[PDB]
Amino acid sequence: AQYEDGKQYTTLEKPVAGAPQVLEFFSFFCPHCYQFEEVLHISDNVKKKLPEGVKMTKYHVNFMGGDLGKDLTQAWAVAMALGVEDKVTVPLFEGVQKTQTIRSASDIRDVFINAGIKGEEYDAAWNSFVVKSLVAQQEKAAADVQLRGVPAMFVNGKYQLNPQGMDTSNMDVFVQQYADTVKYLSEK
């Protein structure tokens, strides 16, 4: 057909019950992820084509960047708990990959301070249990699909996007094909 298993997407041999409907994984250390977020705006363009009643979940992963990678997953939990993803996503990517001024938990914190999140509010979130379980949720989801590489996107715990099987000559076109695949898979 037009959409074929093993081409634009793959099927999980081991489907995950109760999974979020659209689940994206990333790392602020991941160069392709920087592209996906900063240059291609994949997350954004997917959302604009999702049917109504379908919400998008995006999680950070641990297996890149060692110690600071883990710090970044907790900080993403904090970003989620406070609902400030859209203010820290860009400075976190650029701080890790562009300017390389993020080398420690303190430098991660600065980004939030600069973004206007109050220090005492960041620190309370950071140390909170709600954030601890939010870290556990991110790790569980990654574990459940046996995630060993990012960026990655899964739909209804049953399908995994396969971007390798798409023309990259034009970026806009790749992006829409990606978004359209997510939409088709969402209706499946």
Q: Which domain holds residue 162?
A: 1-188
CA distance 72 to 162: 26
Cα–Cα distance between 93 and 40 in angstroms, integer?
14
Give yes or no for a contact between 185 and 155, defined as CB atoms under 8 angstroms apart: yes
CB atoms within 10 A of CB 116: 8
Write out the chain in H/E/C secondary structure.
CCCCECCCEEECCCCCCCCCCEEEEECCCCHHHHHHHHHCCHHHHHHCCCCCCCCEEEEECCCCCHHHHHHHHHHHHHHHHHCCHHHHHHHHHHHHHCCCCCCCHHHHHHHHHHCCCCHHHHHHHHHCHHHHHHHHHHHHHHHHCCCCCCCEEEECCCEEECHHHCCCCCHHHHHHHHHHHHHHHHCC
| Nearest-10 Cα torsion for 23, 34, 51, 13 | -40
Q: What φ, ψ does residue 164 adopt, rounded to 5°?
A: -55, -30
Among residues 14, 36, 138, the alpha carbon closest in space to that of 80 is found at: 138
Task: Extract the tokens encoding 76.
Answer: 């993403």
What are the backbone dihedrals phi and psi of residue 56, each rounded to the nearest 5 degrees, phi first? -105, 135
Resolution in angstroms for this experimental structure?
2.2
Q: How far is CA 162 from the centre of its chain?
A: 16
**What distance in Å separates the CA atoms of residue 25 and residue 149, rounded to the nearest whole number?**
9
Nearest to residue 152, comparing CAs of 1, 74, 72, 42?
A: 42
Domains held by the chain: number = 1
The CATH number of whichever domain residue 118 belongs to comes to 3.40.30.10
With beta carbons less than 8 A apart as the criterion, state whether 85 and 43 touch: no
Nearest to 172 by CA among 160, 164, 162, 180: 180
Tell me the CA distances in angstroms from 23 to 44, 55, 96, 117, 126, one per residue in order: 13, 9, 23, 26, 23
Residue type, 130: V
